[PDB]
């Protein structure tokens, strides 16, 4: 069931912003690693004396990477006179964020019809304000509320190119990398307690609990009216024998935060081939491959949907496959993006639910937990 | 003249250590960008609950990248019980360094016969101590004194694999990249005042002023007995019309620090081809090419040393060429390595001075300052 109870008009995921200590180096690593083009900058060369910000794009996916300059460059400025293109930026908040969490996501940004309204209704409905609505060059309105930990949910709206004050990067610097990634499918948070996190977030957005369908997790997924903004949230399951990865996250991250970003590919096989080509020459590493018994059991479960060749192609690249009652899900997980065992990336592709494809088609992989336990039974097979 | 007045036995450059906020991402960028292999780690997977450290190697060149974990992982430790493989590391110093300077070099490390002696004699002779000598697993001794700004000169000595507590990385993770870079030739500091910086450093090392031979700089080069450790130091020339780049460095870096690392290649042409192949897909950018009039004038100056083809090959890659009274120098400069216009890299190759090649053969490029002014005269040619 879908109550469609959004308290304001939500469009799509708009961008993800990483807070870094050096934005240049993270952005160049991510660009090679994921096949994302350099498409806009805001930094010293564009008159920004406050922060360096570099935008990477692949399809509709927008990864923003921001780091602070020395405060002494902008010490003579005040908020009315600022050179920062993102007015919510704060030297102190950014340094504290990065020293506390290391590299990670500061903002999950969603486009909305009216960001000032979305902020007002949100704060009216329990949201902890983070940065009040600000109208940039009479063109774009930007507002931030607290989502969980030190991650903000960022509203952006356009009357009618990323943000004012950003320049398009010179194409001689802009190499058209592309490994098939196209949009953000879901962004997932880890918290110590799922209940209060849920009722807080659903409280101020009006997002509803999404469909879906004993290892470490309890989760639930919040979704907008058309279920194109998908916001899962995890909590640890204490007391088990293998320590909860959610609990390991909270310890190394110093509390709640964004656990993983799921990027949709239009061709998960080409994406995974290309990312695996570059794992050891600057790119990203991937979780260990499941045992071939896993793949010796997928014929009995999705042989309907994938040919005997594609199932073997899955075995090469280490792809995981799950299946809702409507669609099928292909998914794989990277190793952590940085020093800490905290944030990681998930590459996915969804097959089914044609009307366009409806959101969350196939789910998030729920069945693959029990299916990997009863496949790591291969020790005598 | 060479007094050979080293106050202790100095061998060669041993490694350069960058202090970062995320060591993983800088190291992977640098590895792709410079063609350096991953050869050793010390991090959570090796029991280090304090810092993540990743070593890149090309030839004898060793780039070390270190970032702090959350202090809470090691809060129950004391210095006698530490899990840090580098005992001089300090969460507070590292965070303060990186928030103050951004990405940059924390240590210039030189191998010496006896690091405890080198520290004692150094401190006896004016050196500001930074970390006292510590003997690691009865195998390696490590000591640090202040060099300039927040950069330390690090002494290391071996009784008889990088450091104890580092592991060699699994070769499946270790891709044998190589673009021809082989060793560190010189490491250069910017300071506000050259005199006191000079007499401080020469004071405690016994290094002597090196050979050599109106834009922005005053410099001088300190050198060990065999002149294989070369430590130039710059100061700004105020009052000119084009603001001193040294002065721009001091402002954006928040004071003195390491300005550039010069890496020797055994084939500057293959190095520059390979690095330029990767500039826009994660690697490093290079300074703007000099005008072809520069290259139309190199025949008259080094046509003795380089064929008409190699001189044109220089023009492709943007290589600069200078000439001492003994040798010839090929050199080119990258754009800054990170967000700030502070640290950058220089690729060089030296031709001449065969006895082995003697240090500093060809100099450091002194003649190329006046030669670029009187070549940017091409506006009417
Ligand atoms: C399917 N699956 C899995 O099998 N494992 C295996 C791999 C071997 C050991 C345990 C995971 O670790 C794993 C981890 C995550 Cl975060 C997800 C995931 O995407 C996810 C969501 O998007 C939303 C809510 C909960 C949720 O779990 C799926 C996983
Ligand atoms: C030769 N040369 C040059 O021509 N320029 C040009 C390029 C167009 C505008 C000015 C430089 O900026 C430049 C910069 C540096 Cl740091 C060096 C260099 O390596 C160096 C040392 O190693 C040691 C002491 C001093 C010193 O200067 C050489 C340069
Ligand atoms: Co997921
Ligand atoms: Co130099």
Coordinates of C-alpha atoms in Angstrom, one line a residue, chain A residues 59-346:
Chain A
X59 CA 23.8 10.1 -16.3
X60 CA 21.7 11.9 -13.7
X61 CA 24.0 11.0 -10.9
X62 CA 25.8 14.0 -9.4
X63 CA 28.6 13.5 -6.9
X64 CA 29.8 16.8 -5.3
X65 CA 33.1 16.9 -3.4
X66 CA 33.9 19.8 -1.1
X67 CA 36.8 20.8 1.2
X68 CA 37.6 24.0 3.1
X69 CA 40.3 26.4 2.2
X70 CA 42.2 28.2 5.0
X71 CA 39.7 30.5 6.8
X72 CA 42.3 33.4 6.3
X73 CA 41.4 33.7 2.6
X74 CA 37.8 34.8 3.5
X75 CA 38.4 36.3 7.0
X76 CA 37.3 39.7 5.8
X77 CA 34.0 38.4 4.5
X78 CA 30.6 38.2 6.2
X79 CA 27.6 36.1 5.2
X80 CA 26.1 38.9 3.1
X81 CA 29.4 39.3 1.3
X82 CA 30.5 35.7 1.1
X83 CA 32.2 34.2 -1.9
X84 CA 31.0 30.7 -1.0
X85 CA 28.8 29.3 -3.7
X86 CA 27.1 27.0 -1.2
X87 CA 25.9 29.3 1.6
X88 CA 25.3 26.5 4.1
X89 CA 29.1 25.8 4.1
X90 CA 31.0 26.4 7.3
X91 CA 34.7 25.9 7.9
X92 CA 34.2 24.7 11.4
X93 CA 31.3 22.3 10.7
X94 CA 33.3 20.8 7.7
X95 CA 36.5 20.3 9.6
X96 CA 34.7 18.9 12.6
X97 CA 32.7 16.6 10.3
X98 CA 35.8 15.2 8.6
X99 CA 37.9 14.8 11.7
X100 CA 35.0 13.1 13.4
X101 CA 33.8 10.8 10.6
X102 CA 36.6 10.9 8.0
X103 CA 35.5 10.9 4.4
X104 CA 31.8 10.7 4.0
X105 CA 28.5 12.1 2.8
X106 CA 27.4 15.4 4.3
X107 CA 24.3 16.0 2.2
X108 CA 21.6 13.9 0.5
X109 CA 20.0 16.4 -1.8
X110 CA 16.5 16.0 -3.3
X111 CA 15.0 18.4 -5.8
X112 CA 11.6 19.7 -4.7
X113 CA 9.0 22.1 -6.2
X114 CA 9.6 24.9 -3.6
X115 CA 12.6 24.5 -1.2
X116 CA 11.4 27.3 1.2
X117 CA 8.0 25.6 1.6
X118 CA 9.6 22.2 1.9
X119 CA 11.8 23.7 4.7
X120 CA 8.9 25.4 6.5
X121 CA 6.6 22.4 6.4
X122 CA 9.5 20.2 7.4
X123 CA 10.5 22.3 10.4
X124 CA 6.8 22.7 11.2
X125 CA 6.6 18.9 11.3
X126 CA 9.6 18.2 13.6
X127 CA 12.6 18.7 11.4
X128 CA 15.7 20.0 13.1
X129 CA 16.7 23.0 11.0
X130 CA 20.3 23.1 9.7
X131 CA 20.5 25.9 7.1
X132 CA 17.5 28.2 6.4
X133 CA 16.3 28.7 2.8
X134 CA 18.6 30.9 0.8
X135 CA 17.8 32.1 -2.8
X136 CA 20.8 32.0 -5.0
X137 CA 20.9 34.6 -7.8
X138 CA 17.1 34.8 -7.9
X139 CA 17.4 31.4 -9.6
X140 CA 17.8 28.5 -7.1
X141 CA 16.7 28.1 -3.6
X142 CA 18.6 25.9 -1.1
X143 CA 17.6 24.7 2.3
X144 CA 18.9 22.0 4.8
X145 CA 17.4 20.1 7.7
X146 CA 19.0 17.4 9.9
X147 CA 18.6 13.8 8.6
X148 CA 20.6 11.7 10.9
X149 CA 24.0 12.0 12.6
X150 CA 25.7 14.9 10.9
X151 CA 24.1 14.2 7.5
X152 CA 21.6 16.8 6.3
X153 CA 18.7 16.3 3.9
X154 CA 19.1 19.1 1.4
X155 CA 16.2 20.6 -0.5
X156 CA 16.8 22.4 -3.8
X157 CA 14.3 24.0 -6.2
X158 CA 14.6 25.9 -9.5
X159 CA 12.3 28.6 -10.8
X160 CA 13.1 27.5 -14.4
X161 CA 24.1 24.9 -14.6
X162 CA 24.5 22.9 -11.3
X163 CA 24.3 25.9 -9.0
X164 CA 24.9 29.6 -9.4
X165 CA 28.6 30.4 -9.1
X166 CA 29.7 27.1 -10.5
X167 CA 31.4 27.1 -13.8
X168 CA 31.3 24.3 -16.4
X169 CA 34.7 22.8 -16.6
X170 CA 36.8 23.3 -19.8
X171 CA 36.2 20.2 -21.9
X172 CA 40.0 19.8 -22.4
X173 CA 40.0 19.0 -18.7
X174 CA 36.7 17.1 -19.0
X175 CA 37.2 13.5 -20.3
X176 CA 34.0 11.7 -21.2
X177 CA 34.3 8.7 -19.0
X178 CA 31.3 6.5 -18.7
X179 CA 30.9 2.9 -17.4
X180 CA 27.1 2.8 -17.6
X181 CA 26.1 4.3 -14.2
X182 CA 23.0 6.5 -14.6
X183 CA 21.2 7.6 -11.4
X184 CA 21.1 7.3 -7.6
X185 CA 18.6 4.5 -6.6
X186 CA 18.7 4.8 -2.8
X187 CA 20.8 6.3 0.0
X188 CA 21.1 4.3 3.2
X189 CA 21.8 5.5 6.8
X190 CA 23.0 3.6 9.8
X191 CA 21.7 4.6 13.2
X192 CA 21.8 3.2 16.8
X193 CA 18.0 3.0 17.0
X194 CA 15.7 2.5 14.0
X195 CA 12.4 3.4 15.6
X196 CA 13.0 7.0 16.6
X197 CA 15.1 7.6 13.4
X198 CA 12.1 6.4 11.4
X199 CA 9.4 8.4 13.1
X200 CA 11.6 11.5 13.0
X201 CA 12.2 11.3 9.3
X202 CA 8.8 10.1 8.2
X203 CA 7.5 12.7 10.7
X204 CA 8.7 15.7 8.8
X205 CA 8.6 14.4 5.2
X206 CA 5.5 12.3 5.2
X207 CA 7.4 9.5 3.5
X208 CA 5.8 6.1 3.9
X209 CA 7.2 2.7 4.6
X210 CA 8.1 0.8 1.4
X211 CA 7.0 -2.7 0.3
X212 CA 9.8 -5.3 0.9
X213 CA 9.3 -9.1 0.6
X214 CA 18.8 -13.1 11.5
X215 CA 22.1 -11.4 10.7
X216 CA 23.0 -8.1 12.3
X217 CA 20.4 -5.7 10.8
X218 CA 17.0 -4.4 11.3
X219 CA 16.0 -2.1 8.4
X220 CA 13.1 -0.2 6.9
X221 CA 12.7 2.0 3.8
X222 CA 11.1 5.4 3.6
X223 CA 9.8 6.5 0.2
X224 CA 8.2 9.5 -1.5
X225 CA 4.9 9.5 -3.3
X226 CA 6.1 8.0 -6.6
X227 CA 8.7 6.0 -4.6
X228 CA 11.7 7.4 -6.6
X229 CA 13.3 8.9 -3.5
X230 CA 14.2 5.8 -1.4
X231 CA 15.8 6.2 2.1
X232 CA 16.5 3.0 3.9
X233 CA 17.7 3.1 7.5
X234 CA 19.6 0.4 9.4
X235 CA 20.2 -0.4 13.1
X236 CA 22.4 -3.1 14.6
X237 CA 21.2 -6.4 16.0
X238 CA 23.2 -6.9 19.2
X239 CA 23.9 -10.2 20.9
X240 CA 24.6 -12.3 17.9
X241 CA 27.8 -14.3 17.4
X242 CA 29.3 -12.4 14.4
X243 CA 29.4 -8.7 15.5
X244 CA 26.9 -6.5 13.6
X245 CA 28.5 -4.6 10.7
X246 CA 26.1 -1.8 11.6
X247 CA 27.6 -1.7 15.0
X248 CA 31.1 -1.7 13.5
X249 CA 30.0 1.2 11.4
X250 CA 28.7 3.3 14.3
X251 CA 32.0 2.8 16.2
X252 CA 34.5 3.7 13.4
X253 CA 32.2 6.5 12.1
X254 CA 31.7 8.0 15.6
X255 CA 28.0 7.6 15.4
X256 CA 25.2 7.7 12.8
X257 CA 25.8 8.4 9.2
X258 CA 25.3 7.4 5.6
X259 CA 26.3 3.8 5.1
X260 CA 26.0 3.2 1.4
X261 CA 24.9 4.8 -1.9
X262 CA 23.2 2.5 -4.5
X263 CA 23.9 3.6 -8.1
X264 CA 21.7 2.2 -10.9
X265 CA 23.5 1.1 -14.0
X266 CA 21.9 0.6 -17.4
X267 CA 24.2 -2.4 -17.9
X268 CA 25.6 -3.8 -14.6
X269 CA 27.9 -6.2 -16.6
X270 CA 29.7 -3.4 -18.5
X271 CA 29.9 -1.3 -15.3
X272 CA 31.4 -4.1 -13.2
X273 CA 33.8 -5.1 -16.0
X274 CA 35.0 -1.5 -16.3
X275 CA 35.2 -0.9 -12.5
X276 CA 37.1 -4.2 -12.0
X277 CA 39.5 -3.3 -14.7
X278 CA 40.5 -0.3 -12.6
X279 CA 40.4 -1.7 -9.0
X280 CA 44.2 -1.9 -8.6
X281 CA 45.1 1.1 -10.7
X282 CA 43.3 3.8 -8.6
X283 CA 39.7 2.6 -8.7
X284 CA 37.5 0.7 -6.2
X285 CA 37.7 -2.8 -4.8
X286 CA 34.7 -5.1 -4.5
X287 CA 33.4 -7.4 -1.8
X288 CA 34.7 -11.0 -2.0
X289 CA 32.9 -13.1 -4.6
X290 CA 30.3 -15.6 -3.3
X291 CA 31.1 -19.3 -3.6
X292 CA 30.2 -21.0 -6.9
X293 CA 27.5 -22.9 -5.1
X294 CA 25.7 -19.6 -4.9
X295 CA 25.8 -19.5 -8.7
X296 CA 25.0 -23.2 -8.9
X297 CA 21.7 -22.3 -7.1
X298 CA 20.7 -19.2 -9.1
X299 CA 19.5 -21.3 -12.1
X300 CA 16.8 -22.7 -9.8
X301 CA 15.7 -19.2 -8.8
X302 CA 16.1 -16.7 -11.7
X303 CA 16.7 -19.0 -14.6
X304 CA 13.4 -17.6 -15.8
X305 CA 14.9 -14.1 -16.0
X306 CA 18.6 -14.6 -16.9
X307 CA 20.0 -16.9 -19.6
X308 CA 22.5 -19.6 -18.7
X309 CA 25.2 -17.2 -20.1
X310 CA 24.3 -14.1 -18.1
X311 CA 24.1 -16.2 -15.0
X312 CA 27.7 -17.4 -15.7
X313 CA 28.6 -13.7 -16.5
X314 CA 27.2 -12.9 -13.0
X315 CA 29.6 -15.5 -11.6
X316 CA 32.6 -13.9 -13.3
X317 CA 31.9 -10.4 -11.9
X318 CA 30.6 -11.6 -8.5
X319 CA 27.1 -10.2 -9.0
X320 CA 24.4 -11.0 -6.5
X321 CA 20.8 -11.6 -7.6
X322 CA 17.5 -11.4 -5.7
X323 CA 13.9 -11.3 -6.6
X324 CA 10.7 -9.6 -5.2
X325 CA 7.2 -10.7 -6.2
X326 CA 7.4 -8.2 -9.1
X327 CA 11.0 -7.6 -10.3
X328 CA 14.5 -9.0 -10.1
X329 CA 17.5 -7.3 -8.6
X330 CA 21.2 -7.4 -9.6
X331 CA 23.5 -6.0 -7.0
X332 CA 27.2 -5.9 -5.8
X333 CA 29.0 -4.0 -3.1
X334 CA 32.3 -2.2 -3.1
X335 CA 34.9 -2.3 -0.3
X336 CA 34.8 0.9 1.8
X337 CA 35.5 4.1 -0.2
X338 CA 38.1 5.4 2.2
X339 CA 40.3 4.6 5.2
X340 CA 37.5 3.6 7.5
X341 CA 35.1 0.6 7.3
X342 CA 32.2 3.0 7.0
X343 CA 30.7 4.2 3.7
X344 CA 30.7 2.0 0.6
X345 CA 29.0 1.9 -2.8
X346 CA 26.4 -0.5 -4.3

